[PDB]
Amino acid sequence: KFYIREPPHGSPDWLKVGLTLGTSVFLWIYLIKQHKEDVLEYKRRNGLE
Amino acid sequence: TMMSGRPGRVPLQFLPNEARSLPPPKLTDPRLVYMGFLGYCSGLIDNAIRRRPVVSAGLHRQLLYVTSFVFFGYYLLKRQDYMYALRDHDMFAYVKSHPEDFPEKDKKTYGEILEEFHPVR
Amino acid sequence: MLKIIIPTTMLLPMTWMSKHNMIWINATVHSLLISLISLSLLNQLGENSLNFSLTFFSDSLSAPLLVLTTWLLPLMLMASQSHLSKETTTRKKLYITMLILLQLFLIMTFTATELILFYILFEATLVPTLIIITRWGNQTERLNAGLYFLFYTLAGSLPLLVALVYIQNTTGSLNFLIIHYWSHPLSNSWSNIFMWLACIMAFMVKMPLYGLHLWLPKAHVEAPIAGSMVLAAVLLKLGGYGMMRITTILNPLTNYMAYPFLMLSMWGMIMTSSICLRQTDLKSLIAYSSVSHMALVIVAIMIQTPWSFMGATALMIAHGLTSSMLFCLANTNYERVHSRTMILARGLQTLLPLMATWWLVASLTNLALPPSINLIGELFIITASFSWSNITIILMGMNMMITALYSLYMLITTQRGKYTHHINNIKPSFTRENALMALHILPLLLLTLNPKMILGPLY
Amino acid sequence: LQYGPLAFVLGERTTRKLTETSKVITVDGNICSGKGRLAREIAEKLGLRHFPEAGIHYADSTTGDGKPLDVQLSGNCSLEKFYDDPKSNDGNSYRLQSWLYASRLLQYADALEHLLSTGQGVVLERSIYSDFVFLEAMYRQGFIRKQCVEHYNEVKKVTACEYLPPHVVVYVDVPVPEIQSRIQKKGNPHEMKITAAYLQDIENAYKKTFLPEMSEKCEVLQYSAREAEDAEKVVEDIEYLKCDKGPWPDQDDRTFHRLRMLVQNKLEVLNYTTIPVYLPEITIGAHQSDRVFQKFTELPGRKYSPGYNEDVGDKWIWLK
Amino acid sequence: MNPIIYTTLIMTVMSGTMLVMISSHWLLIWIGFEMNLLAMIPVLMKNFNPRATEAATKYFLTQATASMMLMMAIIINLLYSGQWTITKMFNPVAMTMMTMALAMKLGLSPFHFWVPEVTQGISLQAGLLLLTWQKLAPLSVLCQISQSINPNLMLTMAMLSILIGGWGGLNQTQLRKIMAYSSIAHMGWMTAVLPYNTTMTILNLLIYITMTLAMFMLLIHSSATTTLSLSHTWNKMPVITSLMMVTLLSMGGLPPLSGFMPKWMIIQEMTKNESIIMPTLMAMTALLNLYFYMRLAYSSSLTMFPSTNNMKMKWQFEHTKQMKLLPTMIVLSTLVLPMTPALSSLN
Amino acid sequence: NVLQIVRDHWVHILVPVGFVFGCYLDRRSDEKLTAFRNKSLLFKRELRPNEEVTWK
Amino acid sequence: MPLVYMNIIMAFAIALAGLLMYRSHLMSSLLCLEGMMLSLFIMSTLIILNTHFTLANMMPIILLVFAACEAALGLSLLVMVSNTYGTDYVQNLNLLQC
Numbered sequence A: 001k002f003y004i005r006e007p008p009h010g011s012p013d014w015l016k017v018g019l020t021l022g023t024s025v026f027l028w029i030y031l032i033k034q035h036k037e038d039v040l041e042y043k044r045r046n047g048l049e
Numbered sequence B: 001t002m003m004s005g006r007p008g009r010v011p012l013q014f015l016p017n018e019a020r021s022l023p024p025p026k027l028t029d030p031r032l033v034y035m036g037f038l039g040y041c042s043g044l045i046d047n048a049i050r051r052r053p054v055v056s057a058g059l060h061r062q063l064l065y066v067t068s069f070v071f072f073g074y075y076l077l078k079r080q081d082y083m084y085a086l087r088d089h090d091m092f093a094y095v096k097s098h099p100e101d102f103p104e105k106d107k108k109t110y111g112e113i114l115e116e117f118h119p120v121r
Numbered sequence C: 001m002l003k004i005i006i007p008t009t010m011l012l013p014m015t016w017m018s019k020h021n022m023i024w025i026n027a028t029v030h031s032l033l034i035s036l037i038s039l040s041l042l043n044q045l046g047e048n049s050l051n052f053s054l055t056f057f058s059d060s061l062s063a064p065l066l067v068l069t070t071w072l073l074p075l076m077l078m079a080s081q082s083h084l085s086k087e088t089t090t091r092k093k094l095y096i097t098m099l100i101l102l103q104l105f106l107i108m109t110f111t112a113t114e115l116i117l118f119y120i121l122f123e124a125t126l127v128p129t130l131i132i133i134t135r136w137g138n139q140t141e142r143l144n145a146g147l148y149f150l151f152y153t154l155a156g157s158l159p160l161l162v163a164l165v166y167i168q169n170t171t172g173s174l175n176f177l178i179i180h181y182w183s184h185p186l187s188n189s190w191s192n193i194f195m196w197l198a199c200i201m202a203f204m205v206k207m208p209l210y211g212l213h214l215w216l217p218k219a220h221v222e223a224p225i226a227g228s229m230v231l232a233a234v235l236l237k238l239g240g241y242g243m244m245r246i247t248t249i250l251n252p253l254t255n256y257m258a259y260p261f262l263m264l265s266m267w268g269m270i271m272t273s274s275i276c277l278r279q280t281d282l283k284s285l286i287a288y289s290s291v292s293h294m295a296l297v298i299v300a301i302m303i304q305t306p307w308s309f310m311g312a313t314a315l316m317i318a319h320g321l322t323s324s325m326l327f328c329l330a331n332t333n334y335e336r337v338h339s340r341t342m343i344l345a346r347g348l349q350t351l352l353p354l355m356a357t358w359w360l361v362a363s364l365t366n367l368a369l370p371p372s373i374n375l376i377g378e379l380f381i382i383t384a385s386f387s388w389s390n391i392t393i394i395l396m397g398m399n400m401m402i403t404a405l406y407s408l409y410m411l412i413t414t415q416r417g418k419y420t421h422h423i424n425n426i427k428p429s430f431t432r433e434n435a436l437m438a439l440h441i442l443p444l445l446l447l448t449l450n451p452k453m454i455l456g457p458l459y
Numbered sequence D: 001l002q003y004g005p006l007a008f009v010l011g012e013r014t015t016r017k018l019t020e021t022s023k024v025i026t027v028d029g030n031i032c033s034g035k036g037r038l039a040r041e042i043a044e045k046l047g048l049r050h051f052p053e054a055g056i057h058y059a060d061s062t063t064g065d066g067k068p069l070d071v072q073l074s075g076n077c078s079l080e081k082f083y084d085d086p087k088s089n090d091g092n093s094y095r096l097q098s099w100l101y102a103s104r105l106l107q108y109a110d111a112l113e114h115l116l117s118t119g120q121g122v123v124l125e126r127s128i129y130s131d132f133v134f135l136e137a138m139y140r141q142g143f144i145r146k147q148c149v150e151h152y153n154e155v156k157k158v159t160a161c162e163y164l165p166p167h168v169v170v171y172v173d174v175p176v177p178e179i180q181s182r183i184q185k186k187g188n189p190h191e192m193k194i195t196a197a198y199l200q201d202i203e204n205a206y207k208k209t210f211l212p213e214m215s216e217k218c219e220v221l222q223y224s225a226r227e228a229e230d231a232e233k234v235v236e237d238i239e240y241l242k243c244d245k246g247p248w249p250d251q252d253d254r255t256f257h258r259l260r261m262l263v264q265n266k267l268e269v270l271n272y273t274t275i276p277v278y279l280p281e282i283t284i285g286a287h288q289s290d291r292v293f294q295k296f297t298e299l300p301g302r303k304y305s306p307g308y309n310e311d312v313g314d315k316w317i318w319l320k
Numbered sequence E: 001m002n003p004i005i006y007t008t009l010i011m012t013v014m015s016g017t018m019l020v021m022i023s024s025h026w027l028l029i030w031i032g033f034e035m036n037l038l039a040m041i042p043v044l045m046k047n048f049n050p051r052a053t054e055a056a057t058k059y060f061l062t063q064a065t066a067s068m069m070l071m072m073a074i075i076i077n078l079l080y081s082g083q084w085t086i087t088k089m090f091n092p093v094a095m096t097m098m099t100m101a102l103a104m105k106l107g108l109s110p111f112h113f114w115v116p117e118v119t120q121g122i123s124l125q126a127g128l129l130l131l132t133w134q135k136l137a138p139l140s141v142l143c144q145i146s147q148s149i150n151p152n153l154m155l156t157m158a159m160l161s162i163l164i165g166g167w168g169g170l171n172q173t174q175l176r177k178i179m180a181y182s183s184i185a186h187m188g189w190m191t192a193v194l195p196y197n198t199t200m201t202i203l204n205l206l207i208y209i210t211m212t213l214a215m216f217m218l219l220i221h222s223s224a225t226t227t228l229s230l231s232h233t234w235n236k237m238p239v240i241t242s243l244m245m246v247t248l249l250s251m252g253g254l255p256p257l258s259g260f261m262p263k264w265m266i267i268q269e270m271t272k273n274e275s276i277i278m279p280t281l282m283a284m285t286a287l288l289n290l291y292f293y294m295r296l297a298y299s300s301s302l303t304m305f306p307s308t309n310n311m312k313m314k315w316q317f318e319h320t321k322q323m324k325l326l327p328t329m330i331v332l333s334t335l336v337l338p339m340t341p342a343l344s345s346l347n
Numbered sequence F: 001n002v003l004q005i006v007r008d009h010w011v012h013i014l015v016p017v018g019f020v021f022g023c024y025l026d027r028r029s030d031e032k033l034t035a036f037r038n039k040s041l042l043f044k045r046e047l048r049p050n051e052e053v054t055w056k
Numbered sequence G: 001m002p003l004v005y006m007n008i009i010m011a012f013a014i015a016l017a018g019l020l021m022y023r024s025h026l027m028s029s030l031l032c033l034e035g036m037m038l039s040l041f042i043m044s045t046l047i048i049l050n051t052h053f054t055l056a057n058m059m060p061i062i063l064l065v066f067a068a069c070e071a072a073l074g075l076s077l078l079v080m081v082s083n084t085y086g087t088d089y090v091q092n093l094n095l096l097q098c
């Protein structure tokens, strides 16, 4: 307890932290899946594999 | 407007179905790495402006910055590659269709070509 | 070239994550390591250049300049750590970051394989230099000096950008190999004359040419020690490197458009040496000496013979090292007495013996004393100019006489005589300063031992 | 969440929050009066929050830890030095006056924020509108200059033209000889060096300018020492002041919203306290400014944001 | 003004701009312009004072005159063609009227005075919105009708805009007037490249919008409206001054910053059309913009101006309100040169 | 202790790892330019029985 | 083109010249601004009626609507200027300088 008045960010905003981490994880998963699907579609269209 | 009004162009379509036939950018594309670097710089500037520890505070915020920048950069690279490929395709089609305008030329060697010599003195 | 570029981009996080009392140590050690790594580029071929990839390539002209830049960075670090003791840690890190960015841009400039990328990088070298000058300069005139430098360089360089994009549109490529193998003669016309003017004038302003040089005394006098060291050693050589690279496509128009520039360079070399004879400021004296030497380099490039290019390259390297050493010596004496007047501090020969020895060696190398590479380059340029015409010998002889006169005048005024009676704060020379002088001078003598490493592709 | 436009459209309304007793009361008086005791008693009996006189280091009290900072980092002025050598050549008098005006402006902003976000009334031991009496006394005694007075007037205009006047102004009138007697009995040498004219000039400014000015805005209560010593009658008189001809009846929800948004932003409150008017008294050179700012950043809990100071015991920085 | 009223007026301005950008009918385009102006005027007059009232009056008069000329051009084009679709106009007189009306809306020279006057009159947020959105819409119309623009008139107005913006910004000391003259110069650049590559016009518009947003957000953060007011920011938060110095260097077109990309691409494109004198003059004239950017940078960041005494209390307090996307604007306005080939995606 | 020393002297690996990464990227850039490997008129030759490429 | 269109276009040109040349009053300039849209309305309806563009007959009504919207905006600005300065003179709108 150093501040006479409670700082606005004294405690982590757990809702915001969860939203941020979940959004990052979801975006990375979606990007990986999208790249996989794009590679497969390109292979199918150009008759490689 | 060069490529605007191209036949069969769907309005407000970021990536048409015909773009699926092109090689997608690799996840380790140097352009994607630069996009992630821009996201990291954005996170650092965020911390600096808000007067937090620049490298320590807001690791989740920095992660989201990097992820969003990489995502948008990937889709932007896809669209850029598609547009350049379409430009090259149309150019080659036009060259094929206008042989009178793009004729083959006789190739003569430098033993046959006469070039003036300018001495340096 | 990535094995040299990436270590600098890693030097940046090292500088920004090091402890407050270890920044100088880390930066100096790893800059020396990067210089040692960059020494490998001196192994050049006898037929073609070293083409690493589609973006970066190295040549017998690019290699010595890269090695000079990588070797010059730690010396700038030493001088800066000398004069920036009271700055905060963040500002010290910012200064080191500016130096690192300048070195990175210079490396990419000298290794760029395309004219437009070369233009982008050699223009990018202005921002760190301008920040350094206008932020860590001592006098009130640093702002005006930065304005002069920036606007001279940009007014020179913008028509160069227009010329480069026009050349790309006309020919299809700005790649140096393509424009060399596919070069075509430049017919005598107003359009070709103005293209030649755009390119050559940009690089002449960068040289600088006589009549386009005021920014050089302004910036060199008012910049900090590191800024002065990098401005003369490397940043002046961008013009010469560009002119050597760009004159491939400008023939045979160069045989006729070079007369005004040759006359300006010769007569202004004489004039700037004479100015050095009557200078009341030591930094101004060194700056005008730099102007004279770069005017000689301009003469060599304009006459454009295989013997002139070799002399031009050797003179560029030698002048870079000598000017850096002279600026360092002047900065040490300034730190002693907090004034740049040349006659304020005298008797330094009897107050600081080894520093007087360093002064003597630097002055001997400044004038063309054989077998130094300064003399090698100057003699090659003089012989090529003699082949060009037989009164260039008259002009070169007058310039050499005045060069010796003003060099020894500076040495005698600063060192000889009797010390100033009231100046009693001249402490013994520091180990750091003596090491800086030794690291400036020894590579010069080693290059004298092995001269073919700095004679360019024409060797 | 913090108050803002979204909260306003959600439905938080100042008029709804007000409880008909949300009044701003300022007790004023000359040097060494019973105004402090009167303000304490009024705040206690009426249930209002008491804000003591806004002296130096009030901003220190309201930020970081409650402990006041060093004089070099907060105020750079001394009331003791002003008393000992009023006509100093270093601008101490006007530096002190401007810093005290800024402190009073900050305290008034804090009190208004408290009243608007809580509905409770506030009792200030002095306000912005009574601060100029010291400036007039200093100028008429030759302690400061006309340029200093003009700068004070400019700042006062552009700053206090935005805030609502107090509901009640209670002035305690004490004659100068009694003031000097109380000062002599108190025993503090620095204020024992106060001259008679300086005490007279403050009284003249209070009676001739401040009271006539505030009477037009709203009702003003004037009490002597004996009347002020009995606070029961003062509170009874305050309670039966049903008249209100000020702007407070005219205020609406949108105006209150703007006022609350202004007062909750302290940098926006103090925006015009540092305007580029280069008076020698208050101007600080580049080197001194840089050194003092470096020291302030070197202070324990001041380098980063309040939630991000590791050395004072803040955790979870990497997830904040 | 009530927050609901403010947000609905902002949404009406954006609705008018979107109507202009999506409509295919000249009458609907004119309706969009009218709605934009009608909802924009109170936004300018939000903070009531004589300066705001005068700025709103001048802006309204200029926009009303431009809209009348635009409607006259539409009617004249209808007379000679009987067409309402927005395509290549069928009458040179109607095209001249339309071009002059749109130039007056954009503030191109010699229709520029209202831009610095209104920008100095209105607050920082109002100036930001004004510059960005009110340059966004008429340039969309011009890009649509580019194929019938008269190159001589368009390039004359563009060169006049560049010169006048450079000189005005050179003389001014007020930050809002400096920003207005910078806007005039950048509009000159964009309209100069318009009759050759609308894609390059859009690229320059995007870069200019990013840089202007970053600069105005920094000015709002520093709460400075003059040069001397900005000269005190180094003593309270030196990070803002450094970021603003970098942004100012970018706005001058110095490599390798983002501001060099629009000038570079425009010069290349205009040179492709066998035009050299115009790109050379446009490149050389920008040195005035760079000069007053550098003069502003000397005062704020590269040097340390004298401070005051209450700056200690300002140190003690903290900046509460946050302007989101400011770091993103700062990054995108300085470090997107290597990503240049994305203009094909913009195409 | 080791943990305190490493916390201060961990930056000294940055330049060496950057040099290693740069050499690796140089190798990768070289491996993309094998379009005329063992096909230049001056250096064309038959492969040895136990080698696959002339240079890497 | 008949002479009626000539006269209508001349009327619009006269109204435009009147707006661009102020004398003292902001109200007179507003009156000139209203005349321009009157001429535009007349020209548009003369063109539409002659060519029997049946669906275009609703355009002049919208033109009038936005004309009087602009008139309302100008009157609001004029009353604010009058309250500020005491007269609607355009000489008092000189606080801002180019």
Ligand SMILES: CCCCCCCCCCCCCCCCCC(=O)OC[C@H](COP(=O)([O-])OCC(O)COP(=O)([O-])OC[C@@H](COC(=O)CCCCCCCCCCCCCCCCC)OC(=O)CCCCCCCCCCCCCCCCC)OC(=O)CCCCCCCCCCCCCCCCC
Pocket (backbone or CB within 6 Å): B041, B044, B045, B048, B053, B054, B055, C012, C013, C016, C017, C090, C091, C094, C097, C101, C127, C128, C131, C135, E238, E239, E242, E243, E245, E246, E256, E257, E301, E302, E334, E335, F017
């Ligand atoms: C990464 C290193 C740098 C590379 C740069 C390359 C280009 C990109 C730039 C990106 C910048 C991002 C951060 C921006 C905000 C920085 C704010 C700051 O002060 O930060 C201090 C901060 C540490 O101090 P602090 O106590 O935390 O800071 C608290 C206060 O902010 C302390 O501040 P204060 O309150 O004490 O105020 C003092 C200071 C406060 O002001 C500042 O410090 C300036 C802040 C803004 C700088 C510019 C931001 C970027 C703008 C675009 C740059 C374009 C560059 C290219 C163009 C040419 C050059 C312009 O003000 C002054 O000194 C005023 C006088 C000087 C004004 C004139 C010069 C201004 C800068 C102009 C040059 C800009 C380029 C260089 C930027 C370098 C930034 C670090 O330093 C950093 O965070 C540096 C970056 C550290 C990165 C660590 C990454 C992880 C570990 C290494 C991993 C490496 C890769 C490993 C791979 C795997 C291996 C196995």
Ligand SMILES: CCCCCCCCCCCCCCCCC[C@@H](O)O[C@H](CO[C@H](O)CCCCCCCCCCCCCCC)COP(=O)(O)OCC[N+](C)(C)C
Pocket (backbone or CB within 6 Å): B004, B010, B011, B012, B013, B014, B076, E203, E206, E207, E210, E332, E336, E339, E340, E342, E343, E345, E346, E347
């Ligand atoms: C760095 C400068 C700022 C960059 C930020 C720009 C932000 C743009 C806002 C929209 C981005 C996301 C859009 C995705 C959904 C919309 C996609 C679709 O609706 O638009 C497409 C078109 O929009 C763009 O293509 C997508 C945005 C492209 C932005 C690229 C910026 C490139 C700047 C160069 C530097 C690289 C910066 C890298 C970081 C952004 C197709 O519409 P279309 O009907 O066919 O185009 C009509 C235009 N005509 C008439 C001229 C033809």
Ligand SMILES: CCCCCCCCCCCC(=O)OC[C@H](COP(=O)([O-])O)OC(=O)CCCCCCCCCCC
Pocket (backbone or CB within 6 Å): A016, A019, A020, A022, A023, A026, B060, B061, B064, B065, B068, B069, B072, E328
């Ligand atoms: C998708 C479905 C999953 C669930 C829904 C998620 C909705 C969106 C996620 C919400 C993000 C969030 O709440 O936290 C944002 C954090 C930091 O929060 P804050 O404290 O700064 O407000 O971090 C940030 O501030 C984000 C920074 C990103 C800035 C914008 C980057 C733009 C990318 C493209 C640029 C070209």
Ligand SMILES: Nc1ncnc2c1ncn2[C@@H]1O[C@H](COP(=O)(O)OP(=O)(O)O)[C@@H](O)[C@H]1O
Pocket (backbone or CB within 6 Å): D030, D031, D032, D033, D034, D035, D036, D053, D079, D096, D097, D100, D101, D131, D134, D135, D191
């Ligand atoms: N604006 C000001 N300028 C100069 N001095 C001031 C100012 N405000 C308060 N002071 C000084 O602060 C002191 C506060 O004393 P005060 O609280 O009035 O005593 P008491 O509580 O006995 O009435 C006074 O001596 C007064 O001189």
